[PDB]
Amino acid sequence: DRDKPAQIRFSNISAAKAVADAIRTSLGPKGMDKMIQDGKGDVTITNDGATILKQMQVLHPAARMLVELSKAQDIEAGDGTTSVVIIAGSLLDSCTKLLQKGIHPTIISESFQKALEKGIEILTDMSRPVELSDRETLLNSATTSLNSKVVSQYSSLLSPMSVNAVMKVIDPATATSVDLRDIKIVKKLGGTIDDCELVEGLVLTQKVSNSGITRVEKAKIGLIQFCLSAPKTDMDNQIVVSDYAQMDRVLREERAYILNLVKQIKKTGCNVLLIQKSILRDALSDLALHFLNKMKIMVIKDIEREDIEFICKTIGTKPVAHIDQFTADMLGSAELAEEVNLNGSGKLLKITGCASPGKTVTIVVRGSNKLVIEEAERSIHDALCVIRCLVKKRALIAGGGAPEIELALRLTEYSRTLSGMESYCVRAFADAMEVIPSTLAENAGLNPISTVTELRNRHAQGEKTAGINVRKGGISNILEELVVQPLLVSVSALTLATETVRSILKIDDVVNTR
Amino acid sequence: ARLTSFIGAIAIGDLVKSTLGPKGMDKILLSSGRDASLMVTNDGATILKNIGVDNPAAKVLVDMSRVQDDEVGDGTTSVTVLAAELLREAESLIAKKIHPQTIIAGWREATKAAREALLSSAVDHGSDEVKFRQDLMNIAGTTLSSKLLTHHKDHFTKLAVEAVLRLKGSGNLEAIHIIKKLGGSLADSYLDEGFLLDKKIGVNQPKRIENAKILIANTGMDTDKIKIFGSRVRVDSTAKVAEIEHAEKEKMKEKVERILKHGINCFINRQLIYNYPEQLFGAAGVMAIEHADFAGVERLALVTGGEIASTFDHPELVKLGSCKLIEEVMIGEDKLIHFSGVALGEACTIVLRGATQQILDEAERSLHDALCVLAQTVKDSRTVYGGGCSEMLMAHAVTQLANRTPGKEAVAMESYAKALRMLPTIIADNAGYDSADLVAQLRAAHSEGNTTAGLDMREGTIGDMAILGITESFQVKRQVLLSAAEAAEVILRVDNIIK
Amino acid sequence: ARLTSFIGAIAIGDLVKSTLGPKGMDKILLSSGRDASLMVTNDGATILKNIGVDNPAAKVLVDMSRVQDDEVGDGTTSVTVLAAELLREAESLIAKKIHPQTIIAGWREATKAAREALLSSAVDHGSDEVKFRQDLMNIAGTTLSSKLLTHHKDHFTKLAVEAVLRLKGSGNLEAIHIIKKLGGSLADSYLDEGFLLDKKIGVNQPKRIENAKILIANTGMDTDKIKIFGSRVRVDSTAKVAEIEHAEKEKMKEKVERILKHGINCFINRQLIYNYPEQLFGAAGVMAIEHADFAGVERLALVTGGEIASTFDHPELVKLGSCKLIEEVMIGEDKLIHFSGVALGEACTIVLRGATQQILDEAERSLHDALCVLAQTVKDSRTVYGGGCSEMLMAHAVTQLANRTPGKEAVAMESYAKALRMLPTIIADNAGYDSADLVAQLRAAHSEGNTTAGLDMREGTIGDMAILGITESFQVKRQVLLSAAEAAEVILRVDNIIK
Numbered sequence A: 001d002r003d004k005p006a007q008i009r010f011s012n013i014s015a016a017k018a019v020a021d022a023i024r025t026s027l028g029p030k031g032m033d034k035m036i037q038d039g040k041g042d043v044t045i046t047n048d049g050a051t052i053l054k055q056m057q058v059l060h061p062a063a064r065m066l067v068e069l070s071k072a073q074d075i076e077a078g079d080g081t082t083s084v085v086i087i088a089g090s091l092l093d094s095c096t097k098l099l100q101k102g103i104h105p106t107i108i109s110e111s112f113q114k115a116l117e118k119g120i121e122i123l124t125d126m127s128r129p130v131e132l133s134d135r136e137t138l139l140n141s142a143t144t145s146l147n148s149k150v151v152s153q154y155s156s157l158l159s160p161m162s163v164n165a166v167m168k169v170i171d172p173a174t175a176t177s178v179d180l181r182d183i184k185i186v187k188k189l190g191g192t193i194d195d196c197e198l199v200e201g202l203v204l205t206q207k208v209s210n211s212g213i214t215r216v217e218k219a220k221i222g223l224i225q226f227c228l229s230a231p232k233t234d235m236d237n238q239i240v241v242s243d244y245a246q247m248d249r250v251l252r253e254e255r256a257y258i259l260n261l262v263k264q265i266k267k268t269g270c271n272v273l274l275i276q277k278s279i280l281r282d283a284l285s286d287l288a289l290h291f292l293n294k295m296k297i298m299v300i301k302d303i304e305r306e307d308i309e310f311i312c313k314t315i316g317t318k319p320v321a322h323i324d325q326f327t328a329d330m331l332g333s334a335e336l337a338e339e340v341n342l343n344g345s346g347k348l349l350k351i352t353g354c355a356s357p358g359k360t361v362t363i364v365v366r367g368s369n370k371l372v373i374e375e376a377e378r379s380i381h382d383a384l385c386v387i388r389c390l391v392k393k394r395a396l397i398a399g400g401g402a403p404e405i406e407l408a409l410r411l412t413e414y415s416r417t418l419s420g421m422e423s424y425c426v427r428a429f430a431d432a433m434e435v436i437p438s439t440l441a442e443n444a445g446l447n448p449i450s451t452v453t454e455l456r457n458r459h460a461q462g463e464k465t466a467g468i469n470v471r472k473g474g475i476s477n478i479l480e481e482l483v484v485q486p487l488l489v490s491v492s493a494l495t496l497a498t499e500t501v502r503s504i505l506k507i508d509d510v511v512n513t514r
Numbered sequence B, C: 001a002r003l004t005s006f007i008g009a010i011a012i013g014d015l016v017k018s019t020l021g022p023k024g025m026d027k028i029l030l031s032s033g034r035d036a037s038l039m040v041t042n043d044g045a046t047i048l049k050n051i052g053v054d055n056p057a058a059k060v061l062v063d064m065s066r067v068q069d070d071e072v073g074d075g076t077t078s079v080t081v082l083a084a085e086l087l088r089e090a091e092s093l094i095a096k097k098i099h100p101q102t103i104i105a106g107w108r109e110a111t112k113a114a115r116e117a118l119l120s121s122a123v124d125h126g127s128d129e130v131k132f133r134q135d136l137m138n139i140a141g142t143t144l145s146s147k148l149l150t151h152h153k154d155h156f157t158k159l160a161v162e163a164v165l166r167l168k169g170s171g172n173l174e175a176i177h178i179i180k181k182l183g184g185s186l187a188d189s190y191l192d193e194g195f196l197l198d199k200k201i202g203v204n205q206p207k208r209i210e211n212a213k214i215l216i217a218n219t220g221m222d223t224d225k226i227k228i229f230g231s232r233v234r235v236d237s238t239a240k241v242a243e244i245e246h247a248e249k250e251k252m253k254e255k256v257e258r259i260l261k262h263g264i265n266c267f268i269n270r271q272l273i274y275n276y277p278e279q280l281f282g283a284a285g286v287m288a289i290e291h292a293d294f295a296g297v298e299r300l301a302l303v304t305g306g307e308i309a310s311t312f313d314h315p316e317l318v319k320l321g322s323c324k325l326i327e328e329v330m331i332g333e334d335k336l337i338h339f340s341g342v343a344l345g346e347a348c349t350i351v352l353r354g355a356t357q358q359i360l361d362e363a364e365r366s367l368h369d370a371l372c373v374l375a376q377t378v379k380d381s382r383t384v385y386g387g388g389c390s391e392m393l394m395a396h397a398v399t400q401l402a403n404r405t406p407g408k409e410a411v412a413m414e415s416y417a418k419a420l421r422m423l424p425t426i427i428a429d430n431a432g433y434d435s436a437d438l439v440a441q442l443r444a445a446h447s448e449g450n451t452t453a454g455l456d457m458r459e460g461t462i463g464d465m466a467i468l469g470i471t472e473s474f475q476v477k478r479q480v481l482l483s484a485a486e487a488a489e490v491i492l493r494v495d496n497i498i499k
């Protein structure tokens, strides 16, 4: 009937509001910390919203939908994964009082879609475009958008890695980017972090052997995937062992059995073999390794699946399996190998990979004490992420609360100008846009209502004036502070929030189960 | 008293009451057990199929709805709502101390009057090609206007019309077959003159095959045919396995030599082929196809007059087909075997793209409705108006007929006419407009003398249905009414205890 | 919510619902207090008059019903049932989320349509002397057929007809007056040309009085007139009482001498006469009449053009009357004063006998209805058929009018037409026959085209009302409908809390 769907909608709205209010005092650089307690008694201090959203667990359709929305927002854009929850909560709080009066959800959804389209068009018409066909303007935009993510010393430390990673000019200013398609940043322990340089081909870190000379050029990779494990017995001891007889049998089975397979395999050119991880093999027979020491020995272990996928994509080959194989589709490229250490500990080999169809290049970073390596990794990750976000479009704008107030005033004037019963619903959107500046003013340590009123008055008087400052603690113009953000991080977020609100509003009736 | 089965059958009809009209309500179906799934649906058939009841009348109604859905198109929610309303009216009629025989007689008379009014009100002005074209276009537009998804409807409608119009009045249902394939964009449509497969062995086998000639050889390697070259196993030692393997290898090599000397280039089959015979065929130079579907070979042999070899019986009696051009063009995101170079344009398969699901079911339903309305109106076009026009006329005819029969069955006809005037009310209520005023205006317009009057869904007004352009089928409404009357007569006749 | 006043007003109408039709149900009215009385009644007016409620709406309805009763004659039960049905329909109409303004508009339209249909359906064929006679006979027979007492109806009907026909189209209500007297048999009717008294002083006074001459002398002996012959009492001793008594005696003897010298033989008055002046008048030879009624002398002076003496004011200005023959004939079981020998046959009083009670009320009601229908149809005869014929026609007219008005007030007219088709159902149910089949047959006959179709109470069939011979009044039904509509509009406008 009508009471059951109304109660279901009220319960869903209450659950969504509780989920949104469980975390709210964390937006901005001056956010509060939270100590999450584990099930065993361990406590962990954190302040990121994504970690708290992915760590906690709760069974509810609205909570699962919000988690999926946050995950999609973090995957698509990559920044600002906490404002969408507040936007959805404000929209649901507005829809609550909209439905309390007696309005059909179809008109409310149409008004929300119209308001979203108007806000998107206003954000696109207000933002200013830039250029990026050359390298000077691109480097200027990079150094202008990179000096506002972390602290000053960390920024100065990551600037060399940033300008080394931004030099990867492969796509000639296309529509989309492939920064997540052919990038494999490895990590190496030991040495100095200053010894970093872009490396093509392939980089490994496992010792080949320990014999005489191993400086050859035979494809430098063994395309083999068949089983190399020893045939396991049916039980411990099949018979009674004491004197000879049984000793000679096992001796011949250990010496004159796998050696025949090694001989029949080594009859083909390019004697390069390897193996994957030693997660299922108990112990490898060293007699086979001693017999393989002659006529050139080359073996590399500790190989994962991602390494195989990277090698099969950079070179441009396909692995083969099975034993009955009389083809010749397993060779590679021969150029140069056999590398030594770079004045320090830790074995690491590099291959530049000359004359190869795949121009994939990675960055080999280092560090010490496992303290500046992960930080630099996260820094270059955020760097290439914001670089891809900037190269995806061309529009940019500054943050602080001014665009939110501008959009709220525009929606208010549009609802005042546009006629129809839906305009009231549009007015609800006008009351669901002044949450970020109020939260920022509350977290800064000033009066939020007075600051919001002053910002609204300044926007109504001189259009584009200033916003909300954090370092100084007042109202200063943003043009002096080097801080900007792309337009996609707002447009995509607003569209996703509107879609989630429409999906959670269109779902009602009864919730049957099995 | 009798009330348990009535309530159980009425409550099962109110669950999908909000799923009527183009602007319907959505709901989720939470699953129990180990992993709790979550999905969004917008159709009553999927909800009725993925549910479990225990009442006898409810089970009978569910079975009848499933049978009707398997028969015609999407006739499951309307018949259920009509049966629920009829049962709710019959409960109040019985509560007023009325014998069920008079109610059954009145319902039969009302059904006969409605059928007569529907048969006497049928248009027949289709003596041109453009008339049939616009009629099919309006039918497809009315059928595709049930989910309210304005993204890619015109192109899909035109593609379905072009695919269903190539039959040229040919009565067949095994020629046109659709497949399931995702990946790409919604604005991508590929047109071809043949069909594709659904599985590829790889690329290691040679793809250069000339002189296309289909040869269906049902030679089984593990079905125990005549003259077994091998044997079983004994109980003496563990050396007979090698002999069995050698016998199987020589038998399969003799079969390969026979199939090579028989003359073949593109070997196709549907049995289970092991790795050794497949590798032997690949090394010989003949491409072998394994793991075939249950309807691909059948539809391939039906359109060419061929048949299976009857598990190797008469190799010189089964007629075989041949083609001209067979290649493997990389289209979309998968490599399939093409079937071009033929003169038979009856069997076609249009591949689809996009990043969404739950489309093949509605596509097949629309194609079924289209070919049904094409084979029904081959030379006699019979279409009626929609938007709540035939129901009002039927109710008016029933009310007019329920006035010259003195006795006691007039109350049953009045209840039937009252229950028949409820679908437009629910349709208008599901959108968000005043249903009472619209229903009153429609009734006044129908009583004043206007057989062409309907309601609008874009603005919520009352206009003409023959000016905008909207129609539907003719036998669908008749079958719906017949099924509803049969279900009502079956359920109402039961009132005793459930033993 | 609003439901208390509605239930209180509906429950008050179901108490006398079984008191409709000729075959009504009887009930007892047990009284409390000191002596528990027991009586059997068969009318809703006596039940509603001897009852006490506390609801404001119920009190207003009871007051309106009593006013309408005292105005028209009979119809309290009918208007109460109609108001109860209207309120029961309005409650269900409001419960369906309908504004009361549309309901009021629909009720007004239905009332206007019913009034128009009643005014357009009126017979007027009475240009003969026997036509009015048979119409009055049928009206009296239909009015007297409400208690089902087949013992002495034809003679009483003929007597009432002969008494109401002697007026000869004279508009007056103070001439014909009835009295209450029991004793004798039901088959005893006395006819006279005058009226009688109601009290006799005795037989000791001389009854031989010649030369009849009415002299109204309003000479008061204890009203303190002009020139008091006596005085008051002093405070000194107990000897002035004898002086006051002697003064009163000489004053009354002087008044007797004056009334004797003025010329009189039959002294009549209405004041309080003591024992001493009465004995003095009896010993003198003049019969004095004391303890008169409040309407006998008034009617006697009205039919003769006389008036009271204004308590001794102008004795030479008030015109007096005279008779010819005045005697005392012992008739029945009491001696009364006769009033014969006059030429004015307008004032007559027919004495009744028997051993039963509760007859004067129905007799006066029948006489009121008769003189009302006589003064209304003095030259324009307007009569309608009974037995449930006008209500069906009004309901059919309302249903036909509720079909060309698009909007939202059609449901109110439908509810009004449904509530209007319930009196014949209750009438048939009170007898013991199948009411549903009879109502359906009557509706079918009225819709087929037969304005003269009614139900029979002797056999329970459907026949013609113009062949058997049954009619009623015309303004009674219109007044009943108007009062019911007014009461419904008054009660429906109240929905707030009782403060």
Ligand SMILES: Nc1ncnc2c1ncn2[C@@H]1O[C@H](COP(=O)(O)OP(=O)(O)O)[C@@H](O)[C@H]1O
Residues within 6 Å of the ligand: A026, A027, A028, A029, A031, A079, A080, A081, A082, A083, A148, A399, A400, A401, A436, A468, A469, A470, A483
């Ligand atoms: N330098 C700055 N000056 C003013 N406001 C800032 C600055 N840096 C960040 N902010 C504000 O902080 C908000 C984001 O805070 P937070 O949630 O901690 O980061 P994220 O959204 O990337 O998770 C933004 O809305 C932005 O307005």
